[PDB]
Subunit: 377 residues, 3 copies
Amino acid sequence: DFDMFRTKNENVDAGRYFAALRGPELDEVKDNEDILLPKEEQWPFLLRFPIGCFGICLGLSSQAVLWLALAKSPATNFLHITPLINLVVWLFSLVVLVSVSFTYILKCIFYFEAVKREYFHPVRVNFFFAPWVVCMFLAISVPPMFSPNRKYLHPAIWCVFMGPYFFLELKIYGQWLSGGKRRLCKVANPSSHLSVVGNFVGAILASKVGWDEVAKFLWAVGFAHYLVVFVTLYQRLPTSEALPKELHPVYSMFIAAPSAASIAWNTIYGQFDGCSRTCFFIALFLYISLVARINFFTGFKFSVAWWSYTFPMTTASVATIKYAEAVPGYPSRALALTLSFISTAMVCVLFVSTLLHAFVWQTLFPNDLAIAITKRK
Amino acid sequence: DFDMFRTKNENVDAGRYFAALRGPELDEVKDNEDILLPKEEQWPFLLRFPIGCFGICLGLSSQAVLWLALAKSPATNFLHITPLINLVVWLFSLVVLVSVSFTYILKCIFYFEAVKREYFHPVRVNFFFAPWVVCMFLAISVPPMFSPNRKYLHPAIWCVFMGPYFFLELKIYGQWLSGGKRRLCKVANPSSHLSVVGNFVGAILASKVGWDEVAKFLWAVGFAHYLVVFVTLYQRLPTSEALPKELHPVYSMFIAAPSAASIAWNTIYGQFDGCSRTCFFIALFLYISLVARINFFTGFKFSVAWWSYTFPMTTASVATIKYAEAVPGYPSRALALTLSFISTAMVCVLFVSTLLHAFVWQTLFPNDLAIAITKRK
Amino acid sequence: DFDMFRTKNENVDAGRYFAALRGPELDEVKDNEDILLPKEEQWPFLLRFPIGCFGICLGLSSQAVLWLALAKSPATNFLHITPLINLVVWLFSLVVLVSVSFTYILKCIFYFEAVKREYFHPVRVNFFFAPWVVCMFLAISVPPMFSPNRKYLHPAIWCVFMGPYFFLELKIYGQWLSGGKRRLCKVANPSSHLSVVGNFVGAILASKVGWDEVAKFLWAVGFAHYLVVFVTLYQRLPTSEALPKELHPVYSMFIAAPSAASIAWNTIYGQFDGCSRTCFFIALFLYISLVARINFFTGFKFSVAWWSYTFPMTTASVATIKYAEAVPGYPSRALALTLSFISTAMVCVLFVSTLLHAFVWQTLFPNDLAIAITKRK
Ligand SMILES: CC(C)CCC[C@@H](C)[C@H]1CC[C@H]2[C@@H]3CC=C4C[C@@H](OC(=O)CCC(=O)O)CC[C@]4(C)[C@H]3CC[C@]12C
Ligand SMILES: CC(C)CCC[C@@H](C)[C@H]1CC[C@H]2[C@@H]3CC=C4C[C@@H](OC(=O)CCC(=O)O)CC[C@]4(C)[C@H]3CC[C@]12C
Ligand SMILES: CC(C)CCC[C@@H](C)[C@H]1CC[C@H]2[C@@H]3CC=C4C[C@@H](OC(=O)CCC(=O)O)CC[C@]4(C)[C@H]3CC[C@]12C
Ligand SMILES: [Cl-]
Ligand SMILES: [Cl-]
Ligand SMILES: [Cl-]
């Protein structure tokens, strides 16, 4: 009954995924579709654990970077924040990463057919890049107590975390520019921004190890693929529910890239110039359009994907503290504090609601029917 | 007979507009379409006054900026032009703006159903931005006689004219990036450039009031939406007559944005550097392609839209006088004079022909049948 | 039998070319198509000489620039290369250009109907720009022995070679932005990059004659048309074989433009800054993706188009020697030598195989059936 997904269902085209699945994330089966697995009896645990549980790590590792700059930035020195907030968040986020990583490796050893189904899913494919972006955020945020009294980190740290990321993006980018079944015009969705943001995060790590020329190379590659993905989202593409007819929290993924580019540019050249200010000012316009409404707060439903919509907001807050240093004053101090407060509050709500579902309602790991769709209809 | 358009016809999709209307501006009914109003008997005056009469103001307020720089620029000081040309043009343009604004407000108070029809017209929608761009050109061009002996203008002038413009563009830009019925790929036309040029014109006004950081923010937003609209016009879009098969005066709208960006960049940083020279040199290439032909002059027919094709040519002339200051010489003096002469001559022809039609042929306000199309066919 | 192609078959739409032709270059007739000429009897010689024999000149004139920098660059002065390699290659390439040019002029005087068929071919149209790019490479590479002891060249050389190129691109670019039958979305192919690279090559020549402002203007125009052609190749276009489903040597045409822009920028401003490093670093990423595989070498078949895939690789090597001067060291010396060796080896293989086919197998000038397709089907 469950032996088809066990380790030893051919690769289904992305068109079938868009035709049989509905929703902003393609995680629900339509009403005329038949699945290959039972719909009522509980499934094995390792078959209902999605690849999207790595988004919790992205939401906690990005909050450690923010609180290290708050307690050390010259623009925030009027308040006195203890350095122990970064220590606690940095240790807590590391524990969660190890638990999520160890559980997914077990699934690959026992259920490898289900892992291949998620790889070919047009939306879930971008979450195979997130395991390495969480490790780069944790390395540019190490608590001073644990850091050696040296100016630079060992270059071997950059090679171990940016190696697999570069290998994966070499294959994916080649497919985009070709005329195959998996070209950008056939798969491009709002979540396709996770395969670009990792170029700018790795540029910061390269500078911190003493390799400035390598950082410049990674900035140029991330810049060429963000404009292709940014202009491609305004054209006519496959019809589906991956593009909500109204403004919906999924559009926050368009802010991560510009904010990280501004932060990465200021670290390579030492100053917040006309390039970082343009990157920072593009991401700030998008922040207002998505957050300056009243339905953004009134309409809020819990989901595991919510953990992936908060990390692009905590990154825009890190770039606002760098901008306040280049332009000292009261207009900039208030802007930095306002964005930081909103991001932290959004993460506190998700923390409480996640525990209530797990140990008070027991509805956090339902069956994953989106991976049992038929290949032919 | 006329009570359906009176103040108290549902919102028709942009597809219906493209299917029932023909021409470079979508102002004529096809030969198989039926209208909802009489086609022979004269209509009420307020029902045949379009929103495109604000283009006359754009053609006269942009000519006052040119003649203030001609009499004050160091590169033009060999000729001796009286400062009284700017005074006369500046006062004349203000009178026309007040008369056009007061007449359209009356239509909204008595015929509000016809105003909503123009708002949803894919081409006429961009002319709701023009009432504020005419007021910003008049504020950066005030005749010295009326100006106070101070270095900066009061910041309240910027807030009163750029406030409504920012509010309107927040709503429109949000629709472009969503998956609704009014996304750019469904409505994008050559006239869609009027909703972007106002970001660069407001950046100049911000600098003149002492707010340089605000000007930089408005430059970044205008730059992100011009590349989306510039690359989107080369793709496959709804089939209609909004894109002439040959070069036609409507393509002059592609020059306004690059010329204003170069002028706005030189005011924020004080020098004509490698950014202003690239913006200026892109707009100059387009000027030659559209004006260096012989059919541009042989084929000329009077229209009220002609008043909206001249303002992008008078702006390219203002950027040519700024460039002549950074590069003094005879090659630059001749270039500035040549472009200025052509723009002024084009506006003199429209001035005489407009009066002849009004008081010698009485054919300037025909019935507007493009707003009476049926919603269902 | 051959009188229809003789000098005195209407202009066939680009759609017919894509529907009746197959292959990465549109040079083979499909299996259900009928031709207008005999398929077995040998044709006249002047009717089987394509416009793509000018690609041999591009492969030999670009190799003279490389070997002049190797013997004169400060970064390569540890090795001692004789200046006589540039002299021999420069003289040999000039002889080939004169022979190819004289043969094609004869065809136009006797077979003008076949020349018009190649002009309207969506792929062969871009090879009408190559006759002038070969003359600009030969003028920025003149052997010192033949050069006058002056700092600058005569400006008349720039006018005679860049005049015809500018005239041709004025007409083509106008068609792209219009709504006609030959707009970019209807014809855009990988070979469309040859009509843009000539703007950057002419900028270098302008600087060498003392006209720096003219060079800046040509850089801005080439930059605006490369982003349109670069983003347009990721959209949904006419279905055909012009876009191979896998990585194929034809994709090397995407490297020529970025490499020449970096070289041209360093000559206008004197230094390899953050603009040349971004252009250079984008072209280097594409080089790895196309050359760092094992099927690039195992799968190699001789073709006359191979001569047009090597010139974009010899240009990326010229930009690597300029970068090694701005960043002296051993990491940069090895990179420059590695790319130069590969480009030279690829050209030596094509040289031997071209002579074997001509005088050992007699299969170098087959009948050109792609120009005899019917216009109606
Ligand atoms: C990467 C994503 C987030 C997009 C945001 C930035 C980009 C759109 C790039 C492309 C063009 C760049 C601008 C183009 C040219 C310049 C001039 C550049 O060099 C100068 O000439 C110095 C000017 C000065 O500061 O005086 C200063 C930065 C700036 C404005 C650039 C800022 C960054 C821009 C907007
Ligand atoms: C806004 C519309 C009208 C488009 C026209 C301008 C843009 C296409 C931007 C994006 C990239 C920019 C260029 C990219 C990088 C630079 C380097 C920039 O910074 C430097 O490195 C200084 C170089 C120098 O002047 O020495 C100088 C301006 C320039 C050429 C920029 C000019 C403005 C460009 C062409
Ligand atoms: C032409 C093709 C091959 C594309 C490759 C280059 C372009 C994508 C342009 C557009 C935006 C440009 C960049 C945008 C802004 C700048 C800042 C510009 O001006 C500065 O502010 C100086 C910064 C410094 O060097 O300190 C320096 C070059 C650079 C990075 C530009 C490099 C060239 C870019 C990437
Ligand atoms: Cl950081
Ligand atoms: Cl001004
Ligand atoms: Cl050279």
